[PDB]
């Protein structure tokens, strides 16, 4: 199939918790053009919930990447409020910078901890 | 009499010179690290977004060249009075 005009990929990225424990960390966040702050507050941890939308012009090339998301902060009150948004838009591209940044600099909620030794359940007779 | 010459340039008047030098170094290094991190992250963003000059390598040119010959006019300018005076044999 070569009808790349009709392809798309909606990926709801799992919430990524990014900890900004350094002035350089805040600096890189503010250097991200796709990140906008709508509530001027002091935060040490944020939660990025994004919904990437890819459109393909070829197998390896994205016709258009659009990532929209809501960045959340847990206040000392423990209320969760949207301190900002993610709004990335690009044409011909080879990846999503928002997903790359959150993957490298952030840990997803509910990380999967893998045992050193797998525990076999039941047996080849019962299963 | 013995001569004490203080050529310190007024650094004796800085209170806590060590702490002040450390403060300046820490501020400068903090700025450098912040801008380094911002530049590296921006570069990675451009790399992941836009995806992933030929220099000629010199070679020896052993031109076993004879002594360069000047034009006859330039030779005559260097020695005009010598024409047809010496026995070439």
UniProtKB/Swiss-Prot annotation, chain A:
Q: Which top-rank group of organisms is this from?
A: Eukaryota
Instruction: Please report which protein family the annotation says this sequence is part of.
Output: Belongs to the fungal fatty acid synthetase subunit beta family.
Protein task: Fatty acid synthetase catalyzes the formation of long-chain fatty acids from acetyl-CoA, malonyl-CoA and NADPH. The beta subunit contains domains for: [acyl-carrier-protein] acetyltransferase and malonyltransferase, S-acyl fatty acid synthase thioesterase, enoyl-[acyl-carrier-protein] reductase, and 3-hydroxypalmitoyl-[acyl-carrier-protein] dehydratase.
Under the subunit heading, UniProt states: [Alpha(6)beta(6)] hexamers of two multifunctional subunits (alpha and beta).
What's the protein called, per UniProt?
A: Fatty acid synthase subunit beta
Gene of this entry: FAS1
Swiss-Prot record, chain B:
Which parts of the chain are coiled coil?
Answer: none
Lineage top rank: taxon: Eukaryota
Protein's job: Fatty acid synthetase catalyzes the formation of long-chain fatty acids from acetyl-CoA, malonyl-CoA and NADPH. The alpha subunit contains domains for: acyl carrier protein, 3-oxoacyl-[acyl-carrier-protein] reductase, and 3-oxoacyl-[acyl-carrier-protein] synthase.
Record-stated family = Belongs to the thiolase-like superfamily. Fungal fatty acid synthetase subunit alpha family.
Q: How does it assemble?
A: [Alpha(6)beta(6)] hexamers of two multifunctional subunits (alpha and beta).
Name of the protein described by the UniProt record: Fatty acid synthase subunit alpha
Q: Which residues of the full protein are shown?
A: 920 to 1015 of 1885
């Amino acid at each position: 199939y070569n009808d790349y005009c009709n392809t798309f990929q909606k990926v709801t990225e799992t919430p990524v918790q990014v900890a900004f424990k350094s002035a350089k960390d805040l600096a890189v966040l503010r250097s991200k053009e796709w990140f906008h702050l709508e509530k001027d507050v002091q935060f040490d941890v944020l939660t990025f919930r994004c919904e990437s939308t890819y459109k393909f012009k070829s197998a390896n090339v994205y016709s258009s990447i659009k990532t929209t998301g809501q960045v959340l902060l847990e206040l000392p009150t423990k209320e969760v409020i949207q301190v900002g948004s993610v709004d990335y838009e690009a044409g011909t591209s080879y990846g999503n910078p928002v997903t790359d940044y959150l993957s490298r600099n952030g840990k997803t909620i509910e990380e999967s901890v893998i045992f050193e030794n797998a525990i076999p359940l039941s047996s080849g007779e019962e299963l | 009499e013995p001569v004490m010459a203080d050529l310190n340039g007024g650094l004796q008047f800085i209170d806590n010179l060590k702490d002040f030098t450390s403060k300046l170094r820490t501020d400068l290094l903090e700025t450098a690290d912040i801008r380094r991190a911002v530049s590296i992250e921006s570069a990675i963003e451009q790399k992941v977004v836009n995806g992933d000059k030929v220099m000629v390598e010199p070679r020896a040119n052993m031109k076993f060249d004879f002594p360069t010959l000047k034009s006859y006019d330039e030779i005559k300018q260097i020695a005009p009075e010598l024409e047809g005076m010496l026995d070439l044999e």
